Symmetry: C3
């Protein structure tokens, strides 16, 4: 596919979004599998996952090959409160950051946790003000387990409460003003 959309493929939720910039394509493959390719994109988010978020152990594998800024990250939203969350296992030429809260250790890795506030920004609920919660792995990797709940709990300990899992949770490839490819199952 090449146009913004949502749906199920091979029993798996999937979502594709781009701001029109450059060229971006997403391959929908067997089971939970997908890939992406892009050239001088503006912004895009793509991945496979679940229609609804949840406390789950997210297992993933593949390849991630960015030329410029891109993230490899679990990605989702909650409602009440509205919040966009990231748990980033890998990234390109830019490391995602924000207001430093601390750290969480999970799945053999240590992630820095950050918080940022988007003011009157696009969201699943429209133009809104909301918080972004981040966990960014201190060391890059492609593949393994991401035990979502360990992040959720740690964020809660740092005063970062999550709402209702009324929206998706995808294992996403996201890029900004760059090129590259990914293939993840």
């Amino acid at each position: 596919i090449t146009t913004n959309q949502t749906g199920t493929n091979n029993g798996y939720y999937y979502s594709f979004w781009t701001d029109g910039g450059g060229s971006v394509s997403m391959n929908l493959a067997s089971g939970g599998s997908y890939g992406t390719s892009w050239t001088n994109c503006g912004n895009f988010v793509a991945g496979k996952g679940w229609a609804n978020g949840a406390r789950r152990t997210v297992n993933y594998s593949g390849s991630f090959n960015p030329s410029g800024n891109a993230y490899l990250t679990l990605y989702g939203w909650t409602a009440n409160p509205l919040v966009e969350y990231y748990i980033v296992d890998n990234w390109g030429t830019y490391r995602p950051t924000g207001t430093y809260k601390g750290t969480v250790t999970s799945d053999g890795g240590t992630y820095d946790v950050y918080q940022t506030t988007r003011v009157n920004a696009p969201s699943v609920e429209g133009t809104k003000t909301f918080n972004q919660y981040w966990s960014v792995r201190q060391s890059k990797r492609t593949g393994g387990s991401i035990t979502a709940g360990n992040h959720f709990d740690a964020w809660a300990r740092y005063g970062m409460p999550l709402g209702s899992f009324n929206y998706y949770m995808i294992m996403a490839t996201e890029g900004y003003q760059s090129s590259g490819s990914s293939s993840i199952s």
Copy 2:
């Protein structure tokens, strides 16, 4: 009444305070009912409620007619720690704000929550440094239910702990450098 004071009226706690500025009066009426009138005030706080705060469902009705800056807000203090809290349903020409923490949804509305710190400021415990917790309704209204505990819990999730309800909780009219009136039960 027209002079700073505290007491019970019709079985209800009540409190009146002004910094002397302009003219401010408070009507003590049947049951939980009161009203206020004021002209070019400096600062005043007035309302009816409880001698002691608590997890309760606060039901209120009436009219709120500010000409300038005024708030219509549940208002109280705790000890250990000392904290001044607001849950603002309505306001005048100024919207109460502070350090953005997030949001809480309750009683059919969505309130932004904010935190501010008063340094060496007047309090129920004298000149003190302390935090103010806010919930400010995203849309103005006069009347309904304010389920206090929903705010308390959300604030707690955002790292905003409340102390002991050693002081009042009133459904208050508060004004600053302005005129107007209110009538609330």
Copy 3:
């Protein structure tokens, strides 16, 4: 002793550290008892306590006589997350401070709680970025009970989570660019 080191004395853990500056000595005495003496030091930390932190009631007595900057403080570290904590009962010409979070009341006193972030700083885990949690008594004293858990719980309420007590907890004398002495049991 006069050289950086760790060990047990009279059944009590002990730790001594200095950055070489000026002259600093530590007396290891009976039971939990120690003392320190120093002249124009740079930085030093010394005290007696436990190899491992814990929720305990820490009882201490003695004298604390700083000429310049020094703290009298319970002092420890956790892992996962890595955090350096202080609960300061007394200090010299400088009052320890940071980002104001609020207060906690314990052992007949009221402490301000603060948080600071050390970026790429020395720690028990090496050069690291980490948070420091503080409780600083509003009034100076030498002697009494410090119920550690009351601080731990309050910090948790303020979004300041503690990790695993994989490291020491000492009742410490710490100085910076100054002189003085202490004797504490």
